[PDB]
Structure formats: structure tokens, C-alpha cells
Design a binder for these strands. Structure first.
Lengths: 353, 97, 94, 110, 31, 88
DNA sequence: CACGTACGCGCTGTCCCCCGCGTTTTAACCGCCAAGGGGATTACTCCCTAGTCTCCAGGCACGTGTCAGATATATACATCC
DNA sequence: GGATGTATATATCTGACACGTGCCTGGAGACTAGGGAGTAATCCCCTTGGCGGTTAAAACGCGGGGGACAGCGCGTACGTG
């Protein structure tokens, strides 16, 4: 970010020669690369035009090739497959699942705002419909994220006895994602695999942690509220050879790149991020140098919801990064047409853009 | 070396009457303003200057109330303020009337 | 957007009374709010004075009585003097 | 023979804008007629009040070793002058604080 | 330089110095 | 049990004990009884709900969802607690 | 959270000043001149001045280049160990 | 022979000032209508100085006792680290 205070803090330094170390030069848009090359070369580079995927123009491809040939000696990249030829392959699978009836009625209550129906049995009635997209993501993830929502499911269909058995059934059947998650957990439990689950919101991490606590599965958790000492304890307990832990939950944007997950095999992305580099560093926690097993990624996507255009923007950013960054290490019209188009033995742990 | 009870309070009286900064933290006041506002209607956005103006209004009102409360406590031959002093001041002003 | 204020006039008044003293933005907003508040009070009092006397016009007499009513004590009589002399000069001129 | 457009504030010997006060009085919904000398008189009154508070605030900044008037100096100037204190007693000044005042009962022994 | 405008009001001179010293309060302090 | 609600309700306790003590120190109060703070919290809640109700009425006259600072200035002005420094 | 001590509160004495009552005064209140001016209306006349309109020009606001005072170094002469 | 305090010269910050420019709002000039100033009449209310008579309220004096205030103890609640 050019307007971030670190940019004016570092750009005012009297430095002859600078150098930037990163892994993801492109994250969201070309303005990030423009700010980076303005920090490197002040005034020499004048990247101003954006990239329109729904244009299909030859001058845009000429601009793309100019952006390729301009930064050839200034960018050095080495992939993890070009060097150290022993890395197991990493496969990601996108799973689209039907919504539940509770998820559907919360979605139509949010999208077609129904404040009288949204309060209903809540005594406080403090439902905030600011950030409509955030509420749609919450409804696509789990109905229990909303306040005063569990007791309506429990008293009407689960009979409200709450005798340690119907609550797990309510958490399983309330969301359309946790039935597939429960099937995946049973399949990875009957096989020899350990699974990490990444989430954007720590309240969904609380939901999964309570589900695994009442399930009887030895789970571990890491988020921003956990201090670094307990994070070190959790990582050393999960990476121990005598570990009884099976599933490890992560908040996606925490801890940086210094987190060690050698013993992991399966990565489940519960919530897709707007920045695909965040998801790349999410399933790159287990897919580092030295992994002894085939890393498999399951992405849990709600059907016909707000997350589909989230994946559309994520794939557009991935197409942009594969165009400019991945082709300028150390068919452009084909990948532009691939990025311009809309996209929209099933859980087997076995197996250019 | 321990201090007599009262000279530290006089030092804070002489200190906080000189400076003009806000004596209430920003985030609990914003949370209180949003909680108070959300029962009148849901989905209320707030400018930062609006919450700041509410903050200095609360500062001035409560400081003037503690001056009246201290005068009530001194009038009752005391140096400790009590809730009866607060309810006495508000009434003579007309808030409880 | 041309946002109306009393900035330069209060600034030149400050340079008249204190030629080597500056002023901040928050103090300038406070002075602007003070001038607007006093103008609103005096104009409302003069409008009420015109309404009670069945007068449809506002002259210097209504503003003078509004200053004598709103401004307390000696501040009124000097303000009344300062205004009254100005009207005399403006008559001499227009 | 439109001679140099002589302004009303310079005719009245004032710095506050007479014509702008006239426009605000005409558009302020006070009366449908506004006399000629009323904006002159009101601008002179506003100028005098502004000059009095600015002089006392400059004195308050001078006694605090400051060359720039802050809201604390305006608050001290308003509250230490009793006529301005009962002109703006129902008025809050932001970032102004209070007068330093300790009741004599709370003072220690000697 | 010199002020061109003065006040004809005979208000009393007020010391506006709000700076304070706790030297007189040193009887219960470290002194 | 990791269950908790998103909406917090104890923000009136967010006006802490040393904040009220600092307020009374600015007010010139030497000694404070232990029952002062709950009464001060109730008084602050009453004053805040009065001003915020008037500001919300001023906002919904303008058909808006955002409470501006000028609405707060007008709400304080109507009750006779006029505030300078935000009107312009 | 622990300690410690100052002050709010309860109790007792004491004296003083306010309350209750009786008696005496005295002025408020109501009803009277005695004439005269102030002021509220009703109607009328007149004229000055402020609204309205057209046209224009410079004051105010914004932006930008410079400029003199205040601040921070660059190098040379005097001086201690 | 190495290390240390002071003195003039140059680059940089920083608010203030000269110049440029738009534009829009205030000013100049002309016209008109109506609001307000002025006049006269009529009648009721207020002013200043008096009087007479009723009478209830105000003033004064005195006993006494209830309450304000001062002093002392204590224990606990609040200050302080």
C-alpha cells in the first residue's frame, strides 16, 4: 500500500540501494506492483493502466507483454517444483454443496430484508444488517453465527432436551458444509491422515472446536487470541511423533510464514479469502520442502451464494498472477479468455492453469 | 516512604484541571454510544466527529456535575462525595424535578 | 466546494488586536461557531422585537435593543457605542 | 461612472462583511424587510465581541508563553472574564478544560 | 508590532498562567 | 463451552472506575465513596440516551442512516447545552 | 489484594436563638375627589426607502512559486594532556 | 603529538507573502409600491397629592425548649502502593 505509513517512513530514508524480499509480489491488483516498483525505481516506472479482463483487446495484450519485458531483470523467482525435485504433488478440489433450509431462510431474510422476521423470537432484537456481504457470508457458513439462532432450531425440531446427543446433530444439520465436513472427518479418521482446517472467522473456529469437543476428537486450535507461547505449545504438540491430535484449526491470516506443519496431510479451506495469496500461504503451511505425503486440499463452497463471486474474484487474481508474475520468472489470449469466463470416489485422497 | 492520604488526590486535582485531554477512552465510549443508539433503531452509522462531540459533551456535563456534587458534599460538612450529593444537585438543577 | 465561514475576518481582527499572535484551526472553528451563535441570537431577538411591535422591518433600533437585552451590563453599552458610531460613519458615506 | 465599487464594510470602517450579514439577514427568515443600517450595526457588534475575546485570548496565550491561540486560551479568556462568563455560561467549548479551582476546605493544614 | 486596537473596558488584569508547582506540597512528599 | 454472543451489553462498565475518578479530579473532588460509580454510570446513560434520541430524530428528519456531528450539535443546542468547535 | 488510618457517623452536653403567645400599633385596603397626560384604536395622507431587476467587477478561495528567518551541519583557529 | 571548544559558511525546514485565476457574490444604477411617519378624534387608564374608616396584619416583649453545634470515640471504608 502506497498510502500506508510504512511507505512514507521507508521512502524518506536516504538510501542508495534498496532490495525487497517477498514471496507474493502480486496479490490483488497492478497498483501493488506499481507501488513496489515506485519504491524501487522512483519515477522510472509509470504503471498506471489497469487490466480489464472483459475487453479482449490486442493492445491490452501488448501492454501485458510490455509489463513482462520491462521487469525481466528486476524480478527473480524460483518455484518449488523447478528446484528440489522430490516434492509431492499438491491437488486442490473445489466442493460445492447444497444449503440447508435454515441457511436458505436466513439468506432470503438477509437479502430481502425482513427485520420483523429476523428478530422473531429474539428478546433483544439487536440484528445489525450493516455489511450485507458479511452477513451473507455468515449465513452461508453457519446459521448459529447469528445471535438467538440456536434455540429456535433446538426447540422446534430438536425437541429442546439438550441431552448431549441432539446438539451435535443440530450442529451437523444446521449448515450444509458440516455434513460434508463430518463425512471428510470420518473418512480421514478411518485412514491414516491428519487434517488442518482454515477459517476466516474465529467464531466459526469456535463452532468447529465445540463440535469436535462434543464429538470426542483430540483437536488443537490457533488464532489471534492465542498468545505465542501457547501457539508454540500447540505446534510442538501437533508435530510430535506421539501426537494423539487429529485435526488442527487455524485462523487464516495469523502467525505469518513461520508456522511448522510437517505432520499434516490434508488442508480444508472452509472459507475462501478475497486475497488468493492468503489461501496460498494457508495450504502452503503443510506443502513445504520435506513433506512425505501427497498434500490434498478440499475447498468447501456454498452453492448459489455470495461466495461464488468471491471465488470469481479470487480466480481473476490468480489468472492475473499467472499472467504477469508466473510468466516472467528469473497463449496470453487463451489465459485471458480463461480468466474472462464464468465457472459455475468424490472424496478420495489420491490422484496448465 | 509512604504518602499521607489526600496529597496524592490534591496532586491529581491540580494536574487534571490543567490539562484538557479526554479522560475517557475512545473505544469504550464508542461501544457505549452504539449500544445506546441501537435500541432507537437498528443500522446506525456514526461519524467520528459525532462520537467526539458526544464525548466532550459528556465530559463537560459530568465535570460540572462533580463540581456541584463536591459543593453539596462540602455543604454537608464532608470531604467525600456520595450519591445523595449527586441526586441533590440534579434536583436543584431540575433534572430529577 | 466553496464552504462559507468567517475565517479571514476573525483573522484580520486578531491581527488588529495581536499582530504577532497566531491561531489554530479548532480555535478558529470555535470563533466561527461563536460568531454564528451571537448573530443567530441577536437576529432572533430583533425578529421577536419587530413581531411584538407589529413592525415588518428590522432597522438599527431593533438590533440595538437586542444588544441591550442579550449582552449583559457594560459589554452592552460599549457594544452599543461601537455600533452606533459605525452607522454614523456609514451615513456620512452612504 | 460606476466608481470603483466601494464596499460597505470599508464605508462603515469595519472588517466584518456588511453585505454578507445583509444576505444572511435577508435569507434567514427574520423579517421580509431589512433596513440599511442594521447589517452595519450588527457587523460592528460582532466585530467588537470578536475583538474583545481575541484580545483576552492573546493575553492568555502570552501569559502561557505561547504565540498561537489554542482552545484552552479561549476557555481561560471566557471564564476569567465575568461578563463573558455570563454571556457564554450555557456554552461548551471543546478541548477547553476547566478553570483551576480548589475549594479551601480541601486544602491541608499548616 | 504594536497593536492598533485596544479595549476601553476597565476589566481587571487576570493572571492566566495555569502552570503549577508542587513545591509547597512537599511536606507530605519526598521533602 | 466457547459459546458467547456477538453483541456486548456491559459497555456501561466500559466507563471504568479510574475514568470516573479522573472526572471527579477534574471536578475538584478529593474523596470518592464506593457507591459513586454506579450512580455516575446511570447519569451518563440517561444523558447519553437523551442526546442520542434527539440526534437520531434529527437524522431521520433528513432521511439518513448516518449520525453526523451537526445533528449532535443541534441535539445539544435544543436542550441548552450548546457546544462549540464542530459547527463548521 | 493487602494494609492502615482518616473520616463519616453515632452519642452526649450545652447554650442560644427561634417559636409560641399575648398585647399594642399601624398601615393596607376600600372607597373618594381633582385635573391632566399617555396610550390604544380608527381613519386618512404622504413620502422615503427597501425590494426587485440588470449588469459588472473585484473579494474570496485555491493553488503554487518564492523568500526571509530558524535549524542543522562543514571546516578552520585556539587549547588541554 | 592526540584530543577538544568555539567561530563563519552552506543546505534544509517553515510559515508568510507576491502573483495568477476563476467565479460568484456583492455593489452601482433605476423604478416602484407600500410600510411607516405624522395628524386628529375619542375614550379609558394611570399619576400625585390629599381625606375617612375597618381591621387584620405587623411589630414588640418574654419564657422556654428544641435544635444547632462542638467535642469525643470507633470502626470501617476508602486511599495508597
Amino acid at each position: 500500500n502506497a498510502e500506508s505509513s510504512l511507505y512514507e517512513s521507508l521512502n524518506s530514508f536516504k538510501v542508495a540501494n534498496r532490495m525487497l524480499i517477498t514471496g507474493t509480489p502480486l496479490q490483488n491488483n497492478i497498483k501493488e506492483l506499481a507501488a513496489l516498483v515506485n519504491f524501487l525505481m522512483p519515477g522510472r516506472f509509470t504503471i498506471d493502466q489497469e487490466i480489464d479482463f472483459e475487453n479482449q483487446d490486442e493492445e491490452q495484450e501488448e501492454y501485458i507483454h510490455d509489463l513482462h519485458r520491462r521487469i525481466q531483470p528486476f524480478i527473480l523467482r524460483r518455484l518449488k517444483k523447478d528446484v528440489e525435485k522430490s516434492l509431492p504433488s499438491k491437488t486442490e478440489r473445489i466442493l460445492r454443496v447444497e444449503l440447508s433450509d435454515v441457511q436458505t431462510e436466513y439468506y432470503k431474510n438477509i437479502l430481502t430484508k425482513n427485520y420483523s422476521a429476523l428478530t422473531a423470537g429474539a428478546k433483544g432484537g439487536h440484528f445489525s444488517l450493516l455489511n450485507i456481504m458479511n452477513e451473507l457470508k455468515k449465513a452461508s457458513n453457519h446459521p448459529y453465527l447469528f445471535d438467538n439462532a440456536e434455540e429456535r432450531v433446538l426447540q422446534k425440531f430438536g425437541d429442546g432436551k439438550m441431552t448431549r446427543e441432539n446438539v451435535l446433530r443440530g450442529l451437523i444439520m444446521s449448515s450444509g458444509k458440516m455434513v460434508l465436513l463430518d463425512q471428510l472427518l470420518t473418512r480421514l479418521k478411518k485412514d491414516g491422515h491428519r487434517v488442518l482446517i482454515f477459517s476466516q472467522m474465529v467464531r466459526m473456529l469456535d463452532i468447529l472446536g465445540d463440535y469436535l469437543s462434543i464429538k470426542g476428537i483430540n483437536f488443537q486450535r490457533l488464532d489471534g487470541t492465542v498468545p505465542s507461547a501457547q501457539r508454540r505449545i500447540s505446534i510442538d504438540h501437533f508435530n510430535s511423533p506421539d501426537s494423539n491430535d487429529f485435526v488442527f484449526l487455524l485462523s487464516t491470516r495469523a502467525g505469518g510464514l513461520g508456522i511448522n506443519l510437517m505432520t499434516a496431510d490434508t488442508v480444508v479451506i472452509f472459507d475462501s479469502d478475497w486475497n488468493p495469496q492468503a489461501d496460498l500461504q494457508a495450504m502452503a503451511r503443510a506443502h513445504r520442502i520435506g513433506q512425505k505425503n501427497h498434500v490434498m486440499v478440499y475447498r468447501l463452497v456454498s452453492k448459489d451464494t455470495v461466495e461464488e463471486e468471491v471465488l470469481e474474484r479470487a480466480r481473476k487474481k490468480m489468472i492475473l498472477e499467472y499472467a504477469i508474475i508466473s510468466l516472467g520468472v528469473t497463449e496470453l489470449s487463451a489465459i485471458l479468455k480463461f480468466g474472462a469466463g464464468n465457472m459455475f470416489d468424490v472424496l478420495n485422497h489420491a490422484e496448465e492453469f | 516512604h509512604r504518602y499521607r492520604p489526600g496529597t496524592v488526590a490534591l496532586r491529581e486535582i491540580r494536574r487534571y484541571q490543567k490539562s484538557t485531554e479526554l479522560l475517557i477512552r475512545k473505544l469504550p465510549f464508542q461501544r457505549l454510544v452504539r449500544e445506546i443508539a441501537q435500541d432507537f433503531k437498528t443500522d446506525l452509522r456514526f461519524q467520528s466527529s459525532a462520537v467526539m462531540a458526544l464525548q466532550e459533551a459528556s465530559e463537560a456535563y459530568l465535570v460540572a456535575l462533580f463540581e456541584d456534587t463536591n459543593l453539596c458534599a462540602i455543604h454537608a460538612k464532608r470531604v467525600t462525595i456520595m450519591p445523595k450529593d449527586i441526586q441533590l444537585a440534579r434536583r436543584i438543577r431540575g433534572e430529577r424535578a | 466546494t466553496r464552504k462559507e465561514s468567517y475565517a479571514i475576518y476573525v483573522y484580520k481582527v486578531l491581527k488588529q488586536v495581536h499582530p504577532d499572535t497566531g491561531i489554530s484551526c479548532k480555535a478558529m472553528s470555535i470563533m466561527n461557531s461563536f460568531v454564528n451563535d451571537v448573530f443567530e441570537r441577536i437576529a432572533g431577538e430583533a425578529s421577536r422585537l419587530a413581531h411584538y411591535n407589529k413592525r415588518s422591518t428590522i432597522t438599527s433600533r431593533e438590533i440595538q435593543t437586542a444588544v441591550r437585552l442579550l449582552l449583559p451590563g457594560e459589554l452592552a453599552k460599549h457594544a452599543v457605542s461601537e455600533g452606533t458610531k459605525a452607522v454614523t460613519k456609514y451615513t456620512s458615506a452612504k | 461612472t460606476r466608481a470603483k465599487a466601494k464596499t460597505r464594510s470599508s464605508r462603515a470602517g469595519l472588517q466584518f462583511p456588511v453585505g454578507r450579514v445583509h444576505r444572511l439577514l435577508r435569507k434567514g427568515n427574520y423579517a421580509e424587510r431589512v433596513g440599511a443600517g442594521a447589517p452595519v450595526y450588527l457587523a460592528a457588534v460582532l466585530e467588537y465581541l470578536t475583538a474583545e475575546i481575541l484580545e483576552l485570548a492573546g493575553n492568555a496565550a502570552r501569559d502561557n508563553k505561547k504565540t498561537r491561540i489554542i482552545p484552552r486560551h479561549l476557555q481561560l479568556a471566557v471564564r476569567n472574564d465575568e461578563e463573558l462568563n455570563k454571556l457564554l455560561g450555557r456554552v461548551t467549548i471543546a478541548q477547553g478544560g476547566v478553570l483551576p479551582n480548589i475549594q479551601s476546605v480541601l486544602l491541608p493544614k499548616k | 508590532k504594536i497593536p492598533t486596537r485596544f479595549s476601553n473596558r476597565q476589566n481587571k488584569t487576570v493572571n492566566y498562567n495555569i502552570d503549577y508547582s508542587d513545591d509547597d506540597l512537599l511536606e507530605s512528599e519526598d521533602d | 463451552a466457547k459459546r458467547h454472543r456477538k453483541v456486548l451489553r456491559d459497555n456501561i462498565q466500559g466507563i471504568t472506575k479510574p475514568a470516573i475518578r479522573r472526572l471527579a479530579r477534574r471536578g475538584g473532588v478529593k474523596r470518592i465513596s464506593g457507591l459513586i460509580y454506579e450512580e455516575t454510570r446511570g447519569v451518563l446513560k440517561v444523558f447519553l440516551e437523551n442526546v442520542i434520541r434527539d440526534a437520531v430524530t434529527y437524522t431521520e428528519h433528513a432521511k439518513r442512516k448516518t449520525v453526523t456531528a451537526m445533528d449532535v450539535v443541534y441535539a445539544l443546542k435544543r436542550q441548552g447545552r450548546t457546544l462549540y468547535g464542530f459547527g463548521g
